[PDB]
Amino acid sequence: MWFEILPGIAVMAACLFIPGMATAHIHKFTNGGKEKRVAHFSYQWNLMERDRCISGVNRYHVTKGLENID
């Protein structure tokens, strides 16, 4: 009886799950497999702008370690 309401609830649940999962996976895809960098303040923005410049490929998320120079 009451459990026949569950199909519509499951459809609603899938439709509501899609946005969050899609956002997370798009963020991973477009940021080098890592979380999309958060820049709430100008210091974080400057960190990302420095990251883009030193990557050589104009992408902040290409991280240069001690293998780049030292």
Partner 1 sequence: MFMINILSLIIPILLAVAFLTLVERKVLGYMQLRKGPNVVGPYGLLQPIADALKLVTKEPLRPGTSSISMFIIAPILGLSLALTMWVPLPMPYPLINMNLGVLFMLAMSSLAVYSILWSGWASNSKYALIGALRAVAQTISYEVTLAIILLSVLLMNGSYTLSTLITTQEHIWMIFTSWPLAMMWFISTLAETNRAPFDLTEGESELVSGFNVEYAAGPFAMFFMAEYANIIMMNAFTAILFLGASHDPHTPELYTINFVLKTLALTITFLWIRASYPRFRYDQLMHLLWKSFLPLTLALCMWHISLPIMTASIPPQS
Partner 2 sequence: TMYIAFILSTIFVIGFVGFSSKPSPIYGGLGLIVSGGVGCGIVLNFGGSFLGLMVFLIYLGGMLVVFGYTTAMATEMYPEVWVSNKTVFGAFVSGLMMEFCMVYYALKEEEVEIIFKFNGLGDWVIYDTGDSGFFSEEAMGIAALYSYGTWLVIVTGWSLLIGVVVIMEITRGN
Ligand X SMILES: CCCCCCCCCCCCCCCCCC(=O)OC[C@H](COP(=O)([O-])OCC[N+](C)(C)C)OC(=O)CCCCCCCCCCCCCCCCC
Residues that bind ligand X (CB under 6 A): 39-40
| Interactions with partner 2, residue window 23-62 (CB under 8 A) | 41-43, 46
Tell me, residue by residue from 23 to 42, as one string, x for binding to partner 1 by CB under 8 A and - for no binding: xx-xx-xx----xx-x-xx-
Minimum CB distance to ligand X, residue 44 (Å): 8
DSSP annotation string for 17-64? HHHHHHHHHHHHHTTTTSPPPP-SSHHHHHHHHHHHHHHSSS-TTS--
Tell me how far the alpha carbon of residue 47 is from its chain's centroid: 17
Q: Using CB under 8 A, list all residues that contact partner 2.
A: 41-43, 46
